[PDB]
Amino acid sequence: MQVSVETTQGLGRRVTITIAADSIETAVKSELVNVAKKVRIDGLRKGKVPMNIVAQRYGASVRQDVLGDLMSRNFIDAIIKEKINPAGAPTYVPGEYKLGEDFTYSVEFEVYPEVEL
């Protein structure tokens, strides 16, 4: 929902990204549908499990999965878009996550010299 680049100091940069609360819930909801298909209660048909039960058992873990996925997925799209190239492994600095609310986080890294002449 929002991508901002900042210069920290020297070759240092910081990419701040906001993921829409809506994008999160939509992803959580769809991954839960996929999880349901892998679940088998007793000897009953696989995928035959109440949604509310799937939510109770896997809801939190799926939410953790979606946020991590979106955090890196969006960061990578962002640096491609902004044509910014990190030196080494960037540092993720998560913001405070609040259920049913937009999520903001930052990624810090140094840029580097391209081959010249």
Curated annotation (Swiss-Prot):
Gene null: resulting phenotype: Non-essential; synthetic lethality is seen in a triple tig-dnaK-dnaJ disruption, although this depends on temperature (triple disruptions grow slowly at 20 and 34 degrees Celsius but not at all at 43 degrees) and strain background.
Compartment(s): Cytoplasm
Positions of post-translational ADP-ribosylarginine modification: 45
Disulfide bonds: none
Source taxon at top rank: Bacteria
Modification after translation, per record: (Microbial infection) ADP-ribosylated by the phage T4 protein ModB.
Annotated stretches, region: Ribosome-binding: 1-112
Protein function: Involved in protein export. Acts as a chaperone by maintaining the newly synthesized secretory and non-secretory proteins in an open conformation. Binds to 3 regions of unfolded substrate PhoA, preferring aromatic and hydrophobic residues, keeping it stretched out and unable to form aggregates. Binds to nascent polypeptide chains via ribosomal protein L23. Functions as a peptidyl-prolyl cis-trans isomerase in vitro, this activity is dispensible in vivo for chaperone activity.
Entry remark concerning the domains of this protein: Consists of 3 domains; the N-terminus (residues 1-112) binds the ribosome, the middle domain (residues 150-246) has PPIase activity, while the discontinuous C-terminus (residues 113-149 and 247-432) binds substrate and has intrinsic chaperone activity on its own.
Annotated family: Belongs to the FKBP-type PPIase family. Tig subfamily.
Subunit structure as annotated in this protein's UniProt entry: Homodimer and monomer. In vivo most of the ribosomes are in complex with monomeric TF; binding as a dimer has also been suggested. Uncomplexed TF is in a monomer-dimer equilibrium with approximately two thirds of TF existing in a dimeric state; binding to substrate PhoA induces monomerization, 3 TF monomers bind somewhat independently to a single substrate molecule. TF and SRP can simultaneously bind to ribosomes; TF binding is abolished when SRP is bound to FtsY in the presence of a non-hydrolyzable GTP analog. Contacts ribosomal proteins L23 and L29.
Name assigned to this protein: Trigger factor
Gene that encodes it: tig
Coverage span on the entire protein: 1 to 117 of 432
